[PDB]
Amino acid sequence: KKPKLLNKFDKTIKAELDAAEKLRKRGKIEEAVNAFKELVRKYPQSPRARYGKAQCEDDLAEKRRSNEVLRGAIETYQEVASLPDVPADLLKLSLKRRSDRQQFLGHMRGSLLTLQRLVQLFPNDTSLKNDLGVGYLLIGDNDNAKKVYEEVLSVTPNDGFAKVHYGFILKAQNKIAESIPYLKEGIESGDPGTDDGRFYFHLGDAMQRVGNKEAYKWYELGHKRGHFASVWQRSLYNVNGLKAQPWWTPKETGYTELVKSLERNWKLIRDEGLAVMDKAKGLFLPEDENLREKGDWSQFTLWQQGRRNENACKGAPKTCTLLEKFPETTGCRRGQIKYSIMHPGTHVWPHTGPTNCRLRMHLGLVIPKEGCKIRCANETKTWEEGKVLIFDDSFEHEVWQDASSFRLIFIVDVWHPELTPQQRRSLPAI
């Protein structure tokens, strides 16, 4: 409906306020900034004049693509809420836009503060509670997020947005069966914010984990709806266009000198890893992304997000020195370089990595003769000591360990070879 943005005094200056807003809507942003700055000087308590100043700064940040200008707008949106006699609709618009722009800039804790204030000021607005839940999720506070969506559901139990987010939270807590009805019903609601790749991804995954054969129906519909490159390649942080295939040869990747270095020096890489196992085993950390059905699996990470772990590299100094010659891996801010040890009785659930922007090399270091294998998409392969396998882990893949002794590999992520130097310099780290 027609939002009511003018308090009693602002209606008496609606002519001036309209003129300034007209300048802004016509794109004359600098003229509009000056007009609203004059109105704010003249009517320092006017919320609509203050809101105009903020909206003008916001439009200006967009035109200049300037984070600095947008931080100015963020403080002016707060100023609006600081004034006397702010109409409720205007108060809510100003603080909502504040939170949205804080999130855009990455100020997740500041956005959370604004969202908490919004819910205090408007306790019957369920949408604002849903937005608060997102604020919590964005700072990693799943406990409070869960409580928010529980409150929402206890008032509006058919709220689809709250259903899919509650289901996401449940699935992340390994409450797999319980998450399925929430994710499914929320997607099916078609409510705004439910048509999101994350929810198709995790609904399918939970179904696969419980043996429900409908999982690929949801993967099909997520592909059809544009969230997945295909039903098998379900990464969600993608550069569209990159060559997509589950398995690559060294020459197909162009990183032939890296592969040669890994294979020719494999015993050195092996031996440093074994020494860490023997004398510094705490550098191997258990896998902690809920990817195991059962078994023991740990990793010893030398690089992550394109940053060298200096303490870790003390444990594998020659390996780190060897790898420094290859920026295609050491500067791959969407991958890692790590030793991975897997013991008998391990099954890694089918899963996908987050991004199509990397390829993953595996160098075999200690490979039992029998029992170890990795499937990617429909092809299944085995490791060999001193040999590299390469696969695109944005494709669904699965791992088994049923030997009688441990299996050690070395994992080296590289940028997808078709990514340009500016792409490799600019993409946000994962």
């Binding site: 300037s66 800039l105 992550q304 987050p354």
Partner: peptide
């Protein structure tokens, strides 16, 4: 919490505006 091998976090990147 980071997305290393999987896709389990609500978001896997940190944004910084424009």
């Amino acid at each position: 919490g980071k997305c290393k091998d999987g896709l389990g976090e609500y978001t896997c990147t940190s944004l910084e505006g424009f």
